[PDB]
Design a protein around this motif. Sequence first.
Motif, PDB file in Angstrom:
ATOM      1  N   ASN A  33       2.783  17.436  66.666  1.00 55.88           N
ATOM      2  CA  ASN A  33       2.543  18.854  66.419  1.00 55.88           C
ATOM      3  C   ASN A  33       2.234  19.540  67.749  1.00 55.88           C
ATOM      4  O   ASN A  33       1.412  19.063  68.514  1.00 55.88           O
ATOM      5  CB  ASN A  33       1.418  19.071  65.406  1.00 55.88           C
ATOM      6  CG  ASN A  33       1.123  20.532  65.128  1.00 55.88           C
ATOM      7  OD1 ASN A  33       2.023  21.370  65.174  1.00 55.88           O
ATOM      8  ND2 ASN A  33      -0.128  20.858  64.825  1.00 55.88           N
ATOM      9  N   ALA A  34       2.909  20.659  67.995  1.00 52.80           N
ATOM     10  CA  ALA A  34       2.594  21.570  69.103  1.00 52.80           C
ATOM     11  C   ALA A  34       1.426  22.473  68.678  1.00 52.80           C
ATOM     12  O   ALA A  34       1.614  23.502  68.004  1.00 52.80           O
ATOM     13  CB  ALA A  34       3.822  22.357  69.483  1.00 52.80           C
ATOM     14  N   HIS A  41      -3.577  25.993  62.643  1.00 50.09           N
ATOM     15  CA  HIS A  41      -2.136  25.833  62.420  1.00 50.09           C
ATOM     16  C   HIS A  41      -1.575  27.015  61.615  1.00 50.09           C
ATOM     17  O   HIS A  41      -1.053  26.861  60.519  1.00 50.09           O
ATOM     18  CB  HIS A  41      -1.856  24.495  61.728  1.00 50.09           C
ATOM     19  CG  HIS A  41      -2.549  23.326  62.342  1.00 50.09           C
ATOM     20  ND1 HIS A  41      -2.330  22.932  63.656  1.00 50.09           N
ATOM     21  CD2 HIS A  41      -3.402  22.419  61.814  1.00 50.09           C
ATOM     22  CE1 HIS A  41      -3.044  21.850  63.907  1.00 50.09           C
ATOM     23  NE2 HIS A  41      -3.706  21.519  62.799  1.00 50.09           N
ATOM     24  N   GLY A  42      -1.678  28.199  62.204  1.00 46.61           N
ATOM     25  CA  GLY A  42      -1.332  29.451  61.576  1.00 46.61           C
ATOM     26  C   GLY A  42       0.157  29.744  61.613  1.00 46.61           C
ATOM     27  O   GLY A  42       0.634  30.502  60.772  1.00 46.61           O
ATOM     28  N   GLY A  43       0.888  29.156  62.574  1.00 49.41           N
ATOM     29  CA  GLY A  43       2.280  29.514  62.806  1.00 49.41           C
ATOM     30  C   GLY A  43       3.017  28.506  63.665  1.00 49.41           C
ATOM     31  O   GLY A  43       2.475  27.441  64.002  1.00 49.41           O
ATOM     32  N   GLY A  44       4.263  28.851  64.034  1.00 45.10           N
ATOM     33  CA  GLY A  44       5.147  27.935  64.751  1.00 45.10           C
ATOM     34  C   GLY A  44       5.400  26.673  63.936  1.00 45.10           C
ATOM     35  O   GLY A  44       5.239  26.677  62.727  1.00 45.10           O
ATOM     36  N   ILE A  45       5.787  25.582  64.615  1.00 47.61           N
ATOM     37  CA  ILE A  45       5.924  24.255  63.984  1.00 47.61           C
ATOM     38  C   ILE A  45       4.607  23.850  63.307  1.00 47.61           C
ATOM     39  O   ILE A  45       4.646  23.264  62.222  1.00 47.61           O
ATOM     40  CB  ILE A  45       6.392  23.166  64.980  1.00 47.61           C
ATOM     41  CG1 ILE A  45       6.679  21.835  64.285  1.00 47.61           C
ATOM     42  CG2 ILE A  45       5.388  22.950  66.101  1.00 47.61           C
ATOM     43  CD1 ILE A  45       7.949  21.773  63.528  1.00 47.61           C
ATOM     44  N   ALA A  46       3.460  24.147  63.935  1.00 50.33           N
ATOM     45  CA  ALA A  46       2.141  23.773  63.379  1.00 50.33           C
ATOM     46  C   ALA A  46       1.984  24.299  61.949  1.00 50.33           C
ATOM     47  O   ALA A  46       1.480  23.579  61.053  1.00 50.33           O
ATOM     48  CB  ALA A  46       1.027  24.276  64.264  1.00 50.33           C
ATOM     49  N   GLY A  47       2.413  25.550  61.745  1.00 53.66           N
ATOM     50  CA  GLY A  47       2.352  26.201  60.441  1.00 53.66           C
ATOM     51  C   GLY A  47       3.191  25.452  59.406  1.00 53.66           C
ATOM     52  O   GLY A  47       2.767  25.255  58.260  1.00 53.66           O
ATOM     53  N   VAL A  48       4.385  25.015  59.819  1.00 55.24           N
ATOM     54  CA  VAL A  48       5.311  24.387  58.892  1.00 55.24           C
ATOM     55  C   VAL A  48       4.820  22.969  58.572  1.00 55.24           C
ATOM     56  O   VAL A  48       4.871  22.547  57.416  1.00 55.24           O
ATOM     57  CB  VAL A  48       6.760  24.444  59.401  1.00 55.24           C
ATOM     58  CG1 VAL A  48       7.189  25.888  59.629  1.00 55.24           C
ATOM     59  CG2 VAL A  48       6.973  23.636  60.656  1.00 55.24           C
ATOM     60  N   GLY A  55      -1.661  22.032  53.153  1.00 49.14           N
ATOM     61  CA  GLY A  55      -2.943  22.401  53.747  1.00 49.14           C
ATOM     62  C   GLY A  55      -3.839  21.212  54.075  1.00 49.14           C
ATOM     63  O   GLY A  55      -4.945  21.406  54.567  1.00 49.14           O
ATOM     64  N   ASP A  56      -3.362  19.987  53.833  1.00 51.44           N
ATOM     65  CA  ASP A  56      -4.140  18.770  54.100  1.00 51.44           C
ATOM     66  C   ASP A  56      -4.406  18.643  55.611  1.00 51.44           C
ATOM     67  O   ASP A  56      -5.488  18.235  56.028  1.00 51.44           O
ATOM     68  CB  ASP A  56      -3.420  17.525  53.572  1.00 51.44           C
ATOM     69  CG  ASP A  56      -3.288  17.437  52.057  1.00 51.44           C
ATOM     70  OD1 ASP A  56      -3.911  18.253  51.363  1.00 51.44           O
ATOM     71  OD2 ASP A  56      -2.550  16.541  51.593  1.00 51.44           O
ATOM     72  N   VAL A  57      -3.403  18.999  56.419  1.00 44.94           N
ATOM     73  CA  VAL A  57      -3.481  18.890  57.891  1.00 44.94           C
ATOM     74  C   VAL A  57      -4.561  19.834  58.428  1.00 44.94           C
ATOM     75  O   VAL A  57      -5.340  19.453  59.285  1.00 44.94           O
ATOM     76  CB  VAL A  57      -2.113  19.163  58.545  1.00 44.94           C
ATOM     77  CG1 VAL A  57      -2.207  19.362  60.054  1.00 44.94           C
ATOM     78  CG2 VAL A  57      -1.127  18.058  58.217  1.00 44.94           C
ATOM     79  N   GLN A  58      -4.598  21.074  57.934  1.00 52.40           N
ATOM     80  CA  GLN A  58      -5.589  22.036  58.385  1.00 52.40           C
ATOM     81  C   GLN A  58      -6.994  21.547  58.021  1.00 52.40           C
ATOM     82  O   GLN A  58      -7.916  21.689  58.816  1.00 52.40           O
ATOM     83  CB  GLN A  58      -5.384  23.428  57.782  1.00 52.40           C
ATOM     84  CG  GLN A  58      -6.233  24.485  58.475  1.00 52.40           C
ATOM     85  CD  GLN A  58      -5.916  24.580  59.946  1.00 52.40           C
ATOM     86  OE1 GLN A  58      -4.870  25.101  60.339  1.00 52.40           O
ATOM     87  NE2 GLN A  58      -6.826  24.077  60.768  1.00 52.40           N
ATOM     88  N   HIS A  90      -1.366  15.588  67.494  1.00 50.22           N
ATOM     89  CA  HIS A  90      -1.518  16.986  67.796  1.00 50.22           C
ATOM     90  C   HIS A  90      -1.661  17.134  69.309  1.00 50.22           C
ATOM     91  O   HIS A  90      -2.586  16.605  69.870  1.00 50.22           O
ATOM     92  CB  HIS A  90      -2.727  17.544  67.050  1.00 50.22           C
ATOM     93  CG  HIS A  90      -2.581  17.438  65.575  1.00 50.22           C
ATOM     94  ND1 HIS A  90      -2.116  18.493  64.802  1.00 50.22           N
ATOM     95  CD2 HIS A  90      -2.853  16.424  64.726  1.00 50.22           C
ATOM     96  CE1 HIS A  90      -2.101  18.123  63.537  1.00 50.22           C
ATOM     97  NE2 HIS A  90      -2.568  16.859  63.459  1.00 50.22           N
ATOM     98  N   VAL A  91      -0.727  17.826  69.950  1.00 54.59           N
ATOM     99  CA  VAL A  91      -0.762  17.938  71.403  1.00 54.59           C
ATOM    100  C   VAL A  91      -0.939  19.415  71.751  1.00 54.59           C
ATOM    101  O   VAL A  91      -0.290  20.275  71.167  1.00 54.59           O
ATOM    102  CB  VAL A  91       0.485  17.347  72.077  1.00 54.59           C
ATOM    103  CG1 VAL A  91       0.791  15.922  71.634  1.00 54.59           C
ATOM    104  CG2 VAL A  91       1.700  18.215  71.881  1.00 54.59           C
ATOM    105  N   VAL A  92      -1.806  19.692  72.722  1.00 59.33           N
ATOM    106  CA  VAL A  92      -2.090  21.051  73.118  1.00 59.33           C
ATOM    107  C   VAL A  92      -1.350  21.371  74.419  1.00 59.33           C
ATOM    108  O   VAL A  92      -1.840  21.091  75.497  1.00 59.33           O
ATOM    109  CB  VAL A  92      -3.599  21.279  73.270  1.00 59.33           C
ATOM    110  CG1 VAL A  92      -3.907  22.736  73.618  1.00 59.33           C
ATOM    111  CG2 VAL A  92      -4.335  20.843  72.013  1.00 59.33           C
TER     112      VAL A  92
END
Length: 162
Positions: A33-34, A41-48, A55-58, A90-92
């Motif tokens: 995850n970017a 994780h509101g948007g981008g690939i993170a959102g998807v 919502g388990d990831v959030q 998860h990479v920042v």
Amino acid sequence: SKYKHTVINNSVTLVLGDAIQIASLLPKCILVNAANRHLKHGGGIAGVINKASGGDVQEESDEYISNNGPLHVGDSVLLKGHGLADAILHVVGPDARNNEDAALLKRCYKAFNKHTIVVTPLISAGIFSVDPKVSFEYLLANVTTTTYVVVNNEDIYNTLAT
Ligand SMILES: NC(=O)c1ccc[n+]([C@@H]2O[C@H](COP(=O)([O-])OP(=O)(O)OC[C@H]3O[C@@H](n4cnc5c(N)ncnc54)[C@H](O)[C@@H]3O)[C@@H](O)[C@H]2O)c1
């Protein structure tokens, strides 16, 4: 096949498609995850990714951050896969909008190398506003493990595939 793809080297294959769909295909992999420093994780690939997990990831991310505080740019954290893959790294990536330098992608991509198979988007190539070519270069320079780099934009794919 089943997707358009170009093998770049012994490690890296560039794929046109959806990273989630490619990660499902493989019997064993980590999905990258970017993410941002707060794993929000509101948007981008993170959102998807988050939505594909319902919502388990959030939920998990919040627990990690709530107890451990924000990540540094270039850091990563291996968390649960929630059925999308064996685990999610998860990479920042650096955010160029915040004057964060693309060279921090070195740290992002080196984190791949302890994993056997990695499925990744181009880190920082979306709203973090790093040139996809630059992100891809950092990937090729630092990644030594079997990696499926998945782009969903055919024009980006064509540029990087040349
Ligand atoms: N408060 C907040 O929520 C907040 C604040 C600041 C930053 N941010 C985060 O910053 C994140 C990261 O930006 P980035 O540029 O590293 O991420 P990214 O999602 O924006 O872009 C990564 C690359 O992958 C592509 N892509 C998108 N979906 C894909 C898919 N399904 N498969 C393959 N490729 C796909 C994008 O087009 C882009 O080229 C945002 O997603 C957001 O989570 C959020």
